[PDB]
């Protein structure tokens, strides 16, 4: 769960900045 | 907490995409 | 961190629904 | 991951309130 949340949170957070 | 956050984060993230 | 994130995530998520 | 998510979640959450 931490590995998946880390991947989705990273890419998910980047998309918000864009 | 991880199990609940994982369920809410998954469904919660899906709702945003829609 | 999990205890705090759980409290902020819970109340933080509720505020979004409202 | 928890240390990084905690830093990004904290500052990331503050930016939303502003």
Curated annotation (Swiss-Prot), chains A, B, C, D:
Site (Essential for channel activity, possibly by being protonated during channel activation, and by forming the channel gate and the selective filter): 12
Subcellular locations according to the entry: Virion membrane; Host apical cell membrane
Domain of life according to the entry: Viruses
Seems to be involved in pH gating (site feature) positions: 16
Domain notes: Cytoplasmic tail plays an important role in virion assembly and morphogenesis.
Function of the molecule: Forms a proton-selective ion channel that is necessary for the efficient release of the viral genome during virus entry. After attaching to the cell surface, the virion enters the cell by endocytosis. Acidification of the endosome triggers M2 ion channel activity.
Name of the protein this chain belongs to: Matrix protein 2
Native organism: Influenza A virus (strain A/USSR/90/1977 H1N1)
